[model samples]
Target: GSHLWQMDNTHWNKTIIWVAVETNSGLVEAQVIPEETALQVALCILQLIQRYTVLHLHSDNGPCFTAHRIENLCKYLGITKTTGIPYNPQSQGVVERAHRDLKDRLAAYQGDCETVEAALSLALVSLNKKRGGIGGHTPYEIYLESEHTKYQ
Candidate 1:
């Protein structure tokens, strides 16, 4: 979920971050786009599916997630899409947690566009490497399994 307003030092640009989180592994894929639109969100999801096996998605009942284009894309890709019940956000807890965590990480930075972008990248990397409370392993460790040695 993208913040509707610009941050204090984000160069006064209305940048938005579109994110997809793998619920089981806690792996996240994100993009910073100039605007938050159905097409942009769909494209970000498309890029994620190409690299990971995403069978289904659960999102809030926002127009960007419920748009016809997004529905058609999900149908074409054979992926299931479910929207959370209105006024009941707990149904989408995984994504909501990811969003909060990402923002908290970014809050440590006060920078221009490029600086913020770099900070986001570093934050994600650090996040992926941190051990999860449930599995006692990093998200990247879970996602990569035996292939994670390369990143060590």
Candidate 2:
């Protein structure tokens, strides 16, 4: 309910990785993708919503996110999708910052696609465990603190 998600496509390891972040809790989520398609992005969004309810979604003006697939998903879910500035990934400062750190951490490894994928999820664990801006707790801690449940 208190979520503003940021997403972007990063071309790495001769492939693409769809990265998304929960701006509220700083939790990072990504999927290593061979093809950058709107359907794939939409599926990722669906899984994300299943994991944590999203009230709003934000992303760059790439066709992958702007396509009817993503638009339809957001509208059906009643989630607000922020209109992005064309050709300006920097407008997503939060997600772009994470991209920087992700690339830095991922560069430390030498491997194929799955290797890159494996490194990605693990690297973000440390990132999510780092001290957060709002309390002394980590992002994962905050994520759990405000996580939704059936009883809620």
Candidate 3:
């Protein structure tokens, strides 16, 4: 199992998305989202999990997870979706940390950045290069190379 956070280029339409990866080498397979595409979001997660089976996805009690569209999508994807107890955001801590890391990394960059898109892209590029404490490796390091296969 794993977690993630995602924001939009404009920030005005940011959406946080998380998914658990079930594998011998479980991973955080994605962190991209759309503002209101609950169905698209579910499908995107489905695509990411196509490589594995036997999984549980834990998420906050968002309407996205309760909608009939996503419920039907989950059935098609063969995924079991679990929601956190109402009002307990701590259940989604891993994803919260991911957002903090991204923000921290973005703030580290300097000089009057006009928009979040520029800053976040810069942060993501750097984040890809170094190890992160929680995962013991950078997101990109764990997801982008052959070394990732042997990381665990």
Structural similarity to truth (TM-score) of each candidate:
0.70, 0.79, 0.52
Could you give me the TM-score of model 3 versus the true structure?
0.52
How big is the positional error of residue 28 in model 3, measured in Å on the Cα after superposition? 5.6
> Compared with the true structure, what per-residue lDDT tens digits does model 2 show for residues 49-116?
88776888887788998999899999999999986632244335656667777777677543533577
Query: At residue 114, what lDDT does model 2 achieve?
Result: 55
Local accuracy of candidate 3 as per-residue lDDT tens digits, 1-152: 23222211123225343333322122334344555467756666666556433344555556765667866766776667665532235433544555455556667863457655565556656655564557575555455444334445
lDDT value for candidate 3?
0.49
Model 1, range 2-33, lDDT digits (tens) per residue? Answer: 10111111212355666667664566676676
What lDDT does candidate 3 reach at residue 120?
Answer: 54
Residue 93, candidate 3: alpha-carbon lDDT: 50
Candidate 1 local lDDT, residue 136: 71
2 or 3, which is superior by lDDT? 2
In model 2, what is the error at residue 27, expressed in angstroms? 1.5
